[PDB]
Amino acid sequence: THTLLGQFFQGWGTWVASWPLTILVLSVIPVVALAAGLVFTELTTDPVELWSAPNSQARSEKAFHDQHFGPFFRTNQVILTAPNRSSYRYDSLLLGPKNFSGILDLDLLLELLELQERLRHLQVWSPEAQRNISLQDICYAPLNPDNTSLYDCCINSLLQYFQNNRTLLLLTANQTLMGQTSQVDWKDHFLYCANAPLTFKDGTALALSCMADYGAPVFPFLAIGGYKGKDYSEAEALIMTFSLNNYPAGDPRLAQAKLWEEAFLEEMRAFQRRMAGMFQVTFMAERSLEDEINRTTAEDLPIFATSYIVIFLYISLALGSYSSWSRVMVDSKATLGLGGVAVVLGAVMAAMGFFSYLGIRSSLVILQVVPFLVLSVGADNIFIFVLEYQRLPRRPGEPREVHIGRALGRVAPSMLLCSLSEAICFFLGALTPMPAVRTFALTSGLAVILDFLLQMSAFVALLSLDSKRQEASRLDVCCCVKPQELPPPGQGEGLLLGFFQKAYAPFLLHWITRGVVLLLFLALFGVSLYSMCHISVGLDQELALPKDSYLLDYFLFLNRYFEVGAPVYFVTTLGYNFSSEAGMNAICSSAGCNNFSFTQKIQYATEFPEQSYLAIPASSWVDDFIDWLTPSSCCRLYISGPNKDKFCPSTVNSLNCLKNCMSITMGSVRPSVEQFHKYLPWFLNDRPNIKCPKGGLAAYSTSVNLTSDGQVLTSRFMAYHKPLKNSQDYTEALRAARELAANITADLRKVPGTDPAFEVFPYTITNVFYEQYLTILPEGLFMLSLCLVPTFAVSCLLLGLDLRSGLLNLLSIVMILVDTVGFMALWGISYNAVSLINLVSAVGMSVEFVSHITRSFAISTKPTWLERAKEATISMGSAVFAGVAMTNLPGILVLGLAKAQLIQIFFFRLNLLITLLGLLHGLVFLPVILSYVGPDVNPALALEQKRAEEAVA
Amino acid sequence: THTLLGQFFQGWGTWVASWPLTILVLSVIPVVALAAGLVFTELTTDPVELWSAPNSQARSEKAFHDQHFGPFFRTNQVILTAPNRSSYRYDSLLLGPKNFSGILDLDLLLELLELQERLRHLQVWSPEAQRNISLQDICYAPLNPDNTSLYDCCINSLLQYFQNNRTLLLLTANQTLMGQTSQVDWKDHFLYCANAPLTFKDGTALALSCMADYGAPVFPFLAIGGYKGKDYSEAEALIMTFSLNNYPAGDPRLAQAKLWEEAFLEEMRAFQRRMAGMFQVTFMAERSLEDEINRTTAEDLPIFATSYIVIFLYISLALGSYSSWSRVMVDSKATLGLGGVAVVLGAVMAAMGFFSYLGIRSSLVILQVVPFLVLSVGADNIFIFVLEYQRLPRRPGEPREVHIGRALGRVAPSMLLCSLSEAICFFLGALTPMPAVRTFALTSGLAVILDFLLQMSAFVALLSLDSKRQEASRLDVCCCVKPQELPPPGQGEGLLLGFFQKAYAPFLLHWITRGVVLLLFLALFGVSLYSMCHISVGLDQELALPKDSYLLDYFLFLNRYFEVGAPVYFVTTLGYNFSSEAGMNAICSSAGCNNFSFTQKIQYATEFPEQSYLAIPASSWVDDFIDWLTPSSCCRLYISGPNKDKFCPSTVNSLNCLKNCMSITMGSVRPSVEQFHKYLPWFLNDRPNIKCPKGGLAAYSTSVNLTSDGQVLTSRFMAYHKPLKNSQDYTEALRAARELAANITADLRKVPGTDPAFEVFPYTITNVFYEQYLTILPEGLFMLSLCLVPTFAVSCLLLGLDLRSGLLNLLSIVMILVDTVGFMALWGISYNAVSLINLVSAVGMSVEFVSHITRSFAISTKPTWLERAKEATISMGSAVFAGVAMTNLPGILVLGLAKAQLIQIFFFRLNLLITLLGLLHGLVFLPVILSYVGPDVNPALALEQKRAEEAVA
Numbered sequence A, B: 001t002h003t004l005l006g007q008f009f010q011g012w013g014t015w016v017a018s019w020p021l022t023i024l025v026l027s028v029i030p031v032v033a034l035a036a037g038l039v040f041t042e043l044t045t046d047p048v049e050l051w052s053a054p055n056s057q058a059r060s061e062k063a064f065h066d067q068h069f070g071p072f073f074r075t076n077q078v079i080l081t082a083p084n085r086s087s088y089r090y091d092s093l094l095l096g097p098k099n100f101s102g103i104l105d106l107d108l109l110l111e112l113l114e115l116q117e118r119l120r121h122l123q124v125w126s127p128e129a130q131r132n133i134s135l136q137d138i139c140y141a142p143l144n145p146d147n148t149s150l151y152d153c154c155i156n157s158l159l160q161y162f163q164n165n166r167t168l169l170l171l172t173a174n175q176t177l178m179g180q181t182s183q184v185d186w187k188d189h190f191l192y193c194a195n196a197p198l199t200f201k202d203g204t205a206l207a208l209s210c211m212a213d214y215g216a217p218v219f220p221f222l223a224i225g226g227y228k229g230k231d232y233s234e235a236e237a238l239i240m241t242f243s244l245n246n247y248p249a250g251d252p253r254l255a256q257a258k259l260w261e262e263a264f265l266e267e268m269r270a271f272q273r274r275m276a277g278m279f280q281v282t283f284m285a286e287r288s289l290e291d292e293i294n295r296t297t298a299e300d301l302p303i304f305a306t307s308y309i310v311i312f313l314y315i316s317l318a319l320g321s322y323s324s325w326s327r328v329m330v331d332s333k334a335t336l337g338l339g340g341v342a343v344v345l346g347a348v349m350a351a352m353g354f355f356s357y358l359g360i361r362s363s364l365v366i367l368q369v370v371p372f373l374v375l376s377v378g379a380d381n382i383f384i385f386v387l388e389y390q391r392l393p394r395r396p397g398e399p400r401e402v403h404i405g406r407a408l409g410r411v412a413p414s415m416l417l418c419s420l421s422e423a424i425c426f427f428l429g430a431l432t433p434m435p436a437v438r439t440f441a442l443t444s445g446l447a448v449i450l451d452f453l454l455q456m457s458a459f460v461a462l463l464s465l466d467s468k469r470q471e472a473s474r475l476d477v478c479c480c481v482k483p484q485e486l487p488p489p490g491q492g493e494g495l496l497l498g499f500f501q502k503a504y505a506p507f508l509l510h511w512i513t514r515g516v517v518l519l520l521f522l523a524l525f526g527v528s529l530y531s532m533c534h535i536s537v538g539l540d541q542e543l544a545l546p547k548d549s550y551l552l553d554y555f556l557f558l559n560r561y562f563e564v565g566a567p568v569y570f571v572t573t574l575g576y577n578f579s580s581e582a583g584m585n586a587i588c589s590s591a592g593c594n595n596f597s598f599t600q601k602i603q604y605a606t607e608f609p610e611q612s613y614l615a616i617p618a619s620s621w622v623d624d625f626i627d628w629l630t631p632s633s634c635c636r637l638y639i640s641g642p643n644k645d646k647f648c649p650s651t652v653n654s655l656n657c658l659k660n661c662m663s664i665t666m667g668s669v670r671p672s673v674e675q676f677h678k679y680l681p682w683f684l685n686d687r688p689n690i691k692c693p694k695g696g697l698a699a700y701s702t703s704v705n706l707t708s709d710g711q712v713l714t715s716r717f718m719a720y721h722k723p724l725k726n727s728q729d730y731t732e733a734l735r736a737a738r739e740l741a742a743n744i745t746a747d748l749r750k751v752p753g754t755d756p757a758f759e760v761f762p763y764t765i766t767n768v769f770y771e772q773y774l775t776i777l778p779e780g781l782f783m784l785s786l787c788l789v790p791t792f793a794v795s796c797l798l799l800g801l802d803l804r805s806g807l808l809n810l811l812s813i814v815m816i817l818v819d820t821v822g823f824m825a826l827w828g829i830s831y832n833a834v835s836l837i838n839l840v841s842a843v844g845m846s847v848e849f850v851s852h853i854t855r856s857f858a859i860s861t862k863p864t865w866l867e868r869a870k871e872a873t874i875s876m877g878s879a880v881f882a883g884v885a886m887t888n889l890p891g892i893l894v895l896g897l898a899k900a901q902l903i904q905i906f907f908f909r910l911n912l913l914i915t916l917l918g919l920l921h922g923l924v925f926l927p928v929i930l931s932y933v934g935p936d937v938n939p940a941l942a943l944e945q946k947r948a949e950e951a952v953a
């Protein structure tokens, strides 16, 4: 079969090289026809679309939540610190001695108040609607979501305990307790606020509204960070969350939100530049991450434009046999290098253009790196072809067309094997769940296919033209010089081949070094197989970002100073009869309701925050509901007046609704179906007041979905993950949350009248990203096995190889892969979709280093195995090294200036590591193993070749 | 250049024919990959989408009308006739002696009443909405478009003059006039109704409501047809229009309408089968035409499946050289014929599949005929190739691969020329305005390209395989017979070539016949150039239909019995101040308003119905408005009561609104801006009553678009085209209407305060179809000139031909085309987009007949011109005839059973005509002209060929 491919591609080559210009044109036309489609590119920036499989579980849960509770509100934080400020003692006289941190000075809080108040009245132009977009238009309003004002927006801060009132900060009174009198200050109100956030009146000779301005109780963990336990006076950070209403992607209000976000960042930069030795401001915006991952691609893209020139120069100076110093300017292959680069750039542009035509949304960070890998893969073929063509002895009375045809015939099977292995590998790598790596893998796959199809026609035509210029003795690139006085005739022996034959092959295949390198590579495999088990799964944040981004400082401050991470929502699906008795029993946590209920289970789970990643219990709505129906003057009905048979709001105190909400109380408040249906929508709109602080609107207004008939479709319960820092923490947190939700559903399905399709799932915002790392190891291992099988299967069909060679090939590929994974885990590179597509590309590429040497040893007729290994090493090892390794490395070493930690880590380092391991194995380990346990001589594979040379000449 | 194409395709052929199976596979893979897309076909049936350029003027006017007045209502008619009924005399005694036609008997009208009344209460199931769709849901209601009932639907008939009341039909009273008494019958009311349709009370001792049931005056021309003048008693047809509300294509109510239409047709078929010797019923539905053009494509598609077998059999029996009668079963080319048919079917399926992928909506009537033309074009190439290959003397010591390569090398330039000429021709034919012919032209173009690309690779590979089986002496199709006793060796001289060389060439190029045929073909060109001017532009209706469709009978009845054709709407664009004084003056027609106004101009135009295609004047709304504001107790205002400062409907007669609608009257009723704005919306809802028959709701409710402020955006005026029969009539009617609208705008733009963008255009329903025939002759002539230039330009580059040959080629093509157009006009084939794409395909194809003979004469070395013409005729005329003509004709002669008058006329007849004229010219006229004024010997074109045979062997 191999000899038939030899004849096939020999015939094709002999034809093409006899019609160069016509085929250059016939090959350029479809490439440009495909590359014209690059103007149809519709780029994605949203982290949700680039890094989540839309048919996954986490995305189905997100879709559900978005349907039944609206989308998760956009968070915009400002983490402050005064490290130059010393701590000071201050006695409370009601709580005792306390140590107040430097950041809790008056002046600093006054400066924060000024910053916040300025950030309220901030507007933009918004030239889309031609009206000044103001905060009340887009801001998140938990109370009064309609007719929202600048004093109704979810602006959490330490100053929401004084409703952003300068006189309430500067307020001081005289409290006489236990006979002694002292000055009660803001600090006393702050300390009374931190220990109990839901108090309408302070308990220290002050009628201060401890509840927030917008009218929901600001919890300490959203106002201060860096404390440990309940010692809130020792707080080392002041947080300020400008929450905005989120909308779907097709809503112009989201565009207006992002305009306000940009203005917020500009204002915050102005504030940071203002306060130098006072604060250490670290801020962000919901747009910031999308802005920081999609900023660099335009900044460091010229460095890749340099990467191409580094390869062009190398191919140009490495193929030009300079051995006269009088005709270097006539023979140095400039045209071939330029052609080669043009071919691979044509191939990548054709691939990207074709995938622009199908309307596949390809991000900037995908188009940034495709061309690099396709070039590094698709220059090796043209290099090996030119080397083989240059090393062929032109037979007497044979034209250049048949000579080029014959060269192509010799090194076509190996080039086809290489291209098919890499194409298959990339197209099987494309099964990753992430759309980004999927699109990337498919792009690189198609690009390698088109690159091979161009290398067969366009490049062979160009080599024919270039060789024709050589025979005419015309200059390297300028073929219009009209040759001068007859240059001395060009006959050499090769410098690279000379160097190898003199030094390397005797040194490597010496009596001593063979044993040494065999033991060394077994030791390397052993160490690697050990060090593999110390691998860290997860592409954690701070890697997508550059090294100079403010978000790095922000994420340092989050992971260091915060006290509760992302808030998790235990969303209850439809098919639960909440209006029933046993329905309310299994969700309640107080006295009267059954033991080991929903809220009680979560409250029990948050005891051990290390085992179960929940730091704070679930804020249940049924508990605050049944407490709202307690006869404590919250719910009342009118007895007379024109407003008969309706609710009496607790805000009024007239003698016309002194009737309590419900009947006699002695045991447990358990309203019947009608009572439940009539009292729930009153609860979900009972704004909290001083009369009784209980009220549904405060924190449950949007946490229950009611249909028109009065049926609770779904209901979510808010719990807080402990500070999540690593990607491991995020994944284990999701896993523990899911397990807890499953354990709760196992108990809740036992209630009579619950549809068994009813399930509770712990939805948080960062679940669509950190779900795969649950089960990326099985999927990845499966993908690498499914890439190792067909590569080997094609390898031992295309080369016409036996099994004694095939097993050595497969062993060498597996050894490279284990060594790569070992050093990947050792260096500190994590394992995820990016590392997976790189390991798949490694399985695809390493064939280049292995297959050439294995074949060059197979088709060999020297008496002893050492001489077969010697000649195989010299010829094909020279080709492999000079072509493959030094077209990978001068490309890779340029990526080391990417500025984006993502590429800087997962492309530069991995491809460097794979290249160096491929080089080492393919040139050092494989010749020695071939010298030891290589195949037999088998002369009817060098004898069977001349049947293929004189037949189709 | 030609010799370089010779070498190029020789090299390619020699390669492919040396690797047959691999290239069969490599060529079948992309064909199947493209042909898999046939499942993505989204077929159009709507005559609007298939037969109108959406960027045209008529479609812009339609879009405008659809925006500002809603879509044109769907018409469903039933034309009745009683030809077996004799006429009878009946005296009126108020109008005088009258002759009543047989169809105006009582019993017949009673049967019509029963039919109509049954057609009112008709419902369907409609399994889409699972509710019984009834008439009131979808029926067109001019009065009361909301809360519509079965007695509020636009059901015009002769029985709307008795509101579908059996007792009002059977009613008879005793009228004493001038002292004499007689029985007044329904006939008297009918005659009083016909002469004045808008009368609430009859004038013959009867209080009969002459106005219709649904409450709009039924005009005589919508109830009776076949009369001539005002002699309505001599009516020979009874019409019944079940008008339905039309909707856009995305409305399920349209689907429900079409369900009701299907049920209507079923009911009408039942009625037609019921009454045999009583009525001659001819009916339709708005869906009927869409149903009749898209029914046949599934019925007569097997006949095309037969057309392929007729060509397969011919190619199979015409290439098998049978000259032994012992080895006919070893040599007859069955595999080649089957392969050829498979290739062309692959090509057409690949083309259709590719155009299914781009989402191009391709109708059934387009996919019905593409494969035929592509096959008839793409079998000639393979036939000529096989003939040339069979006629080549295999040189001693030359393998079959080089022999097939050499054959392909010889007849590649001519095949490429043929394919490029046809591709270019079709792709320039694609510039037709119609989407149907555009899609068709593009499809055939791409199919011919892919067919040529397959003929170069797949077919040459298959010919190599077949020839290999021949050399092995294995049977025709079953190549597994393992040859028997050695068959006698196969050496012949050809039967076709023998017959030609013996009989034809001496007979044609005799001293006598050359002069005869030259004079004959000049006479043919002359007669054709005369008969061309008697051409009929327009694809008239009755051609899209089969010969057995009921719509043929319906269209006969329309063109014979109707008295006014389609109703035209003189739609007035925005930018006219109707509320002004001069505004109302230039649209009014009565006394007071200016002379030569809008309505007066249309009323003057309808005087001569032959010159201007308007049979009835425009029903103006401003005239009936200003007549409605006449103090004649139509409009009144309340003087007291709780309903102060509003209109007082004329229906009431209380003493509370005896105030007239306007001030003192002495001259002309000219309401000011405020009066106009306050009185217009009252007019457009004043339902006509007995008090005064004037009222806007009757016929102007929807003929004025009012904005919320009270500004008339647009306003349409209803006029009736005289009975339009031919396509010429439709086109001249549109042209005359447009001219009249332009003349009116030229006067209306002179009113001060009219935006000069304001224009009036005469919109009717059949304008999107019959607009092109205004200017199809310039567009068609331009397209044929732009197809003649590049064909000739490519012809005298690819063949390497001089100008003395090129001019004879161009002359022969022009002569064929003029002859085709002459016989096209003579036979009775009309000229439109279909005939245009066929004439373009003719310009493309005729190159096959001409170029081969011209070249075969060019490359010739006989001493005298007669001998050059003789040998050119014999060799290449045998190839042209046997291949081209007898692969066109056995294909075409099958289309003559299409059953669809469209294809039966415009494909069968035209392609037959073009084939026979191509045959005649290419084989009779061209050899003789080449014998007379042919080129010189020029030996360096037969001498320059062997440079191309031994070089690339």
Ligand SMILES: CC(C)CCC[C@@H](C)[C@H]1CC[C@H]2[C@@H]3CC=C4C[C@@H](O)CC[C@]4(C)[C@H]3CC[C@]12C
Pocket (backbone or CB within 6 Å): A046, A047, A048, A050, A051, A289, A363, A365, A366, A367, A369, A370, A436, A437, A440, A539, A540, A541, A544, A769, A834, A837, A902
């Ligand atoms: C061309 C391909 C193979 C490499 C570039 C694509 C990768 C590196 C890009 C595309 C989409 C990006 C991810 C999108 C979502 C987020 C947001 C945050 O939650 C963590 C970072 C993370 C997870 C990004 C990391 C980098 C990322 C994965």
